[PDB]
């Protein structure tokens, strides 16, 4: 602030200025004290030469000739030197006395001292500096737009050089002017009776000698400026390249500096070569990253990670990550986790320390741009079995995931078509068995054909995209489970008819109206599960009777009003979903569905229940729901295996006590109105709620 | 990696030795020059009437 801004030439100039100021003050003092002119009339055994002149006349003559004969420069030399020294001092100190650049200088001094003070600089070369990086970058952005301070300093140096040149040029001629003795011929005759006078003043010779030495000082002063001027105009201090810190410490950051920054760097380096080295560290971005890593390590402990450990959806020990700046190393200390979850974590690099986590088979990624290490990639290829990835604009999709051979289940949540899906070939995935895609795929990508040799389950659930091209799905010979949710086909696709190995079929939100393609489903004798969620189905074709393998039927949220009798011919159906439909009467043929265990007609218009419905003694889940039933038949007591009942939303008046005969159906599984439950006998309700 | 400080100190000592040598060399001769009394003959005649 007051000392680190002085190069050696500046110190020498300051010392010379101090010496010149002392010389000027001494000269002024002697001029005031002893600088007197003695005068005598000039023209006239040797005897005395009395001039019969009084003291007053002598003083008058001294004053007159002093004003006349004595050289103006000779008389003004002390004041002249004092003024020149004061101007030199003022132009030297105006560099820091100007507040506009003084603020920048003070900020630079503070930041340089703080950066040199931080031991983390030495640690990086071999705590709160993390926030100090923000001040460092603020200063580098703000002050690189300056360079005016360099121009100010150059102008000051030029002014000093010009002053020195003028000083030498005129003082060289003026020094010879002064003389010890002098002669003056003023018109003091008829005033004092004399005209010619010889005079002298004491300081002259001394002044001469003094002036000589003074000139020498100024000469050196000028020479000093020349060197600095040469140093100003030989090195081009506007740009500074380290080329040594990068070579030694092996850091490619800190490329270069602007005019003002290079100027200040040169000044500090000339003042001290090591201060620049210590200050350059906080410009490095990699150093900032490592300091943030150290701060995160201080912030994060394995205890916090183990606290956040929980059970994932697919039965694994998972550590969800929701907002982090990287990978804490303590996470690699906890190998018991089988799954890992990442949410909104950008700029992630996976080191070889992932090899520590042996018992890892699942990974969850939510909007994360992640890259791996070679050992990390090999470990993921050889160990991972399940993978979940969420990406928004494909920038968080890691390409190396296409090379994981041992992966079994993969989940994609992110648009791929944005028409063709932007999917790379799935050839390396030699063990992929389950695939789930959440995208906007219009035509099926060819990459899936590269995995169908061992693929068993492929799921594509678009947000409404029509599956216009079904050509590749016929290649899924090994596929046993297929779900096409919101594929907007409006009909049963012909591709599904080409998959004889299929077992479970889902067509949720496909808006199927004409479903007369059931005959084609007769080519599939393994169709155990068929799903038709959220469609406009109003008619059930008779051909559904020919599906021998049917075990589960789904027709919830459709336009079904009158359900045909032959719909009950599939005696092997165990799950029958008829809720949220226009069903009003249940045909008695449902009694033949002895194997049935599920029945849901919630949000339908059912008004009565046939007694044959109670013949299905294997029914363990009966969801009557919100219907138009006004009374409850006692035959419900026959269902000893019934575990769940849902009759809330109906017109029931009194519940028969036979509901107590349902052993597996308790109060928790009983969905009835409060009055309906209270109408039951005390013993029945006590046995339902507890064991009395 | 320094050793420049030793050279600086050597230069300072050499300068001091040279200064002392010059001081002795000229002061030894110059001391005898001064005298208490002195005589001067200047052209102060026709100015004060004496030389």
Residue numbers in the entry:
A (entry chain F): 16 to 59, 95 to 176, 236 to 527, 531 to 804
B (entry chain E): 254 to 304
Copied sentences from the primary study:
We then set out to characterize the full-length protein and collected cryo-EM data for an LRRC8C homomer from three independent preparations. Unexpectedly, the two-dimensional (2D) classes from these datasets showed in all cases a heptameric assembly, which was confirmed by 3D reconstruction. Despite the large size of the combined dataset, the non-symmetrized reconstruction of the full-length protein did not reach high resolution, probably due to the intrinsic mobility of the complex. After application of C7 symmetry, we were able to obtain a structure extending to 4.6 Å for the full-length protein and 4.1 Å for the PD. At low contour, the map displays an envelope for the entire protein, and at higher threshold, where the density of the more mobile LRRDs has largely disappeared, it defines the structure of its membrane-inserted portion. This map allowed a molecular interpretation with subunits consisting of the structure of the PD determined by cryo-EM and the X-ray structure of the LRRD to obtain a symmetric channel with a pore radius of 6 Å at its extracellular constriction. In this assembly, close subunit interactions are restricted to the extracellular part, whereas contacts within the remainder of the protein are scarce. In contrast, there are fewer contacts in the case of LRRC8C homomers, which have formed a larger heptameric assembly. In this case, the LRRDs show increased mobility compared to the A subunits, and we did not find any indication of tight subunit interactions. Similarly, the interaction interface in the PD is reduced and restricted to contacts between the ESDs. In that respect, the larger heptameric assembly of LRRC8C homomers described in this study is noteworthy, as it would allow for a further increase of the pore radius, although there is so far no evidence for the existence of heteromeric channels with larger oligomeric organization in a physiological context.
